[PDB]
Design a binder for these strands. Structure first.
Length: 30
DNA sequence: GACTAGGGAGTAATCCCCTTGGCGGTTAAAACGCGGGGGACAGCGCGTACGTGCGTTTAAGCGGTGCTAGAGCTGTCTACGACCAATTGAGCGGCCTCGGCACCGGGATTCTCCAGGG
Protein backbone atom coordinates (compact mmCIF):
# COMPACT_ATOMS: atom_id res chain seq x y z
CA UNK A 1 0.00 0.00 0.00
CA UNK A 2 1.48 3.32 -1.14
CA UNK A 3 -0.13 5.16 1.78
CA UNK A 4 2.01 7.88 3.36
CA UNK A 5 1.71 9.14 6.91
CA UNK A 6 -0.73 12.04 7.46
CA UNK A 7 1.05 15.20 6.36
CA UNK A 8 3.79 13.55 4.29
CA UNK A 9 2.21 14.77 1.04
CA UNK A 10 0.88 17.91 2.74
CA UNK A 11 4.21 19.76 2.64
CA UNK A 12 4.74 18.82 -1.01
CA UNK A 13 1.23 19.91 -1.93
CA UNK A 14 1.60 23.22 -0.05
CA UNK A 15 4.78 23.82 -2.03
CA UNK A 16 2.81 23.06 -5.20
CA UNK A 17 0.20 25.72 -4.44
CA UNK A 18 2.54 28.39 -3.09
CA UNK A 19 4.48 27.98 -6.32
CA UNK A 20 1.28 28.44 -8.34
CA UNK A 21 -0.58 31.71 -8.86
CA UNK A 22 -3.82 30.71 -10.63
CA UNK A 23 -7.47 31.22 -9.64
CA UNK A 24 -8.27 28.93 -6.70
CA UNK A 25 -12.05 29.57 -6.82
CA UNK A 26 -14.28 28.18 -9.56
CA UNK A 27 -15.69 31.09 -11.54
CA UNK A 28 -19.29 29.90 -11.93
CA UNK A 29 -20.13 29.36 -8.21
CA UNK A 30 -18.44 32.69 -7.48
C1' DG B 1 -44.82 73.99 -75.93
C1' DA B 2 -45.95 68.13 -75.91
C1' DC B 3 -44.25 64.35 -75.10
C1' DT B 4 -39.48 60.97 -74.56
C1' DA B 5 -35.52 58.59 -72.60
C1' DG B 6 -32.67 57.06 -68.71
C1' DG B 7 -31.11 56.24 -63.69
C1' DG B 8 -30.87 56.48 -58.53
C1' DA B 9 -34.33 56.39 -54.90
C1' DG B 10 -38.87 54.25 -53.23
C1' DT B 11 -40.97 49.87 -52.66
C1' DA B 12 -40.23 45.22 -52.34
C1' DA B 13 -38.58 40.25 -52.71
C1' DT B 14 -34.12 36.99 -51.71
C1' DC B 15 -30.85 35.53 -49.29
C1' DC B 16 -29.01 34.11 -45.49
C1' DC B 17 -26.45 34.54 -41.66
C1' DC B 18 -27.43 34.89 -36.61
C1' DT B 19 -29.10 33.32 -32.84
C1' DT B 20 -33.48 32.12 -28.67
C1' DG B 21 -34.81 27.80 -26.40
C1' DG B 22 -34.46 22.59 -25.18
C1' DC B 23 -31.91 17.93 -24.93
C1' DG B 24 -28.18 14.22 -25.08
C1' DG B 25 -23.10 12.73 -24.45
C1' DT B 26 -18.98 12.77 -21.85
C1' DT B 27 -15.09 14.25 -19.06
C1' DA B 28 -13.59 16.50 -14.50
C1' DA B 29 -14.31 18.16 -10.20
C1' DA B 30 -16.81 17.66 -6.24
C1' DA B 31 -19.07 14.44 -2.63
C1' DC B 32 -18.95 10.62 0.49
C1' DG B 33 -17.05 6.85 3.34
C1' DC B 34 -13.44 3.61 5.96
C1' DG B 35 -8.65 1.96 8.61
C1' DG B 36 -5.85 3.57 11.06
C1' DG B 37 -2.88 6.32 13.03
C1' DG B 38 -0.61 10.66 14.79
C1' DG B 39 -1.99 15.06 17.07
C1' DA B 40 -4.56 16.96 21.33
C1' DC B 41 -4.75 16.99 25.67
C1' DA B 42 -5.37 15.35 30.76
C1' DG B 43 -2.52 14.20 35.42
C1' DC B 44 1.21 15.38 37.54
C1' DG B 45 5.86 17.03 39.63
C1' DC B 46 8.90 20.48 40.32
C1' DG B 47 12.08 24.17 40.75
C1' DT B 48 13.29 28.32 40.35
C1' DA B 49 11.89 32.66 39.18
C1' DC B 50 9.47 35.75 40.17
C1' DG B 51 5.30 37.72 44.12
C1' DT B 52 5.83 39.98 48.21
C1' DG B 53 7.38 42.38 53.17
C1' DC B 54 10.94 45.73 54.87
C1' DG B 55 15.60 48.50 55.31
C1' DT B 56 18.37 52.50 52.88
C1' DT B 57 19.20 55.80 49.95
C1' DT B 58 19.06 59.18 44.78
C1' DA B 59 15.84 61.83 42.42
C1' DA B 60 11.20 64.41 40.21
C1' DG B 61 8.40 67.62 42.05
C1' DC B 62 8.66 71.22 44.65
C1' DG B 63 9.45 76.62 45.28
C1' DG B 64 11.54 80.24 43.27
C1' DT B 65 14.78 83.14 40.20
C1' DG B 66 17.39 85.91 36.49
C1' DC B 67 17.54 86.69 32.39
C1' DT B 68 18.20 85.19 26.61
C1' DA B 69 17.72 83.68 21.91
C1' DG B 70 14.21 82.08 19.02
C1' DA B 71 9.07 82.93 17.41
C1' DG B 72 4.79 86.20 15.63
C1' DC B 73 3.48 90.22 13.25
C1' DT B 74 4.41 94.99 10.82
C1' DG B 75 5.71 97.06 5.90
C1' DT B 76 7.52 96.33 1.13
C1' DC B 77 8.86 95.00 -3.46
C1' DT B 78 9.62 92.18 -7.19
C1' DA B 79 10.38 87.70 -9.38
C1' DC B 80 7.19 84.98 -11.00
C1' DG B 81 2.65 82.29 -12.34
C1' DA B 82 -2.01 82.00 -14.35
C1' DC B 83 -4.48 84.51 -18.03
C1' DC B 84 -5.04 83.96 -25.07
C1' DA B 85 -3.48 80.17 -29.58
C1' DA B 86 0.31 78.57 -33.81
C1' DT B 87 2.54 75.04 -33.58
C1' DT B 88 4.26 70.61 -34.74
C1' DG B 89 6.02 66.88 -33.17
C1' DA B 90 5.53 63.13 -29.15
C1' DG B 91 2.42 59.66 -29.31
C1' DC B 92 -1.41 57.22 -29.67
C1' DG B 93 -5.36 54.38 -32.88
C1' DG B 94 -5.25 50.22 -36.04
C1' DC B 95 -2.75 46.17 -38.35
C1' DC B 96 1.16 42.01 -39.27
C1' DT B 97 4.22 39.36 -38.22
C1' DC B 98 7.51 35.36 -36.40
C1' DG B 99 9.41 34.51 -31.59
C1' DG B 100 9.00 33.32 -26.62
C1' DC B 101 5.67 31.23 -24.14
C1' DA B 102 2.61 26.82 -23.37
C1' DC B 103 3.20 22.63 -22.24
C1' DC B 104 4.39 17.58 -22.48
C1' DG B 105 7.87 13.71 -23.17
C1' DG B 106 12.82 10.60 -21.98
C1' DG B 107 15.89 10.70 -18.76
C1' DA B 108 18.87 11.69 -15.02
C1' DT B 109 18.26 12.89 -10.36
C1' DT B 110 16.44 12.90 -6.25
C1' DC B 111 13.03 12.17 -1.98
C1' DT B 112 10.82 8.77 0.77
C1' DC B 113 9.19 3.55 3.20
C1' DC B 114 10.01 -0.95 4.87
C1' DA B 115 11.28 -5.17 6.94
C1' DG B 116 14.14 -7.20 8.32
C1' DG B 117 18.87 -8.22 10.32
C1' DG B 118 23.11 -5.79 12.35
Amino acid sequence: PHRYKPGTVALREIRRFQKSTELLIRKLPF
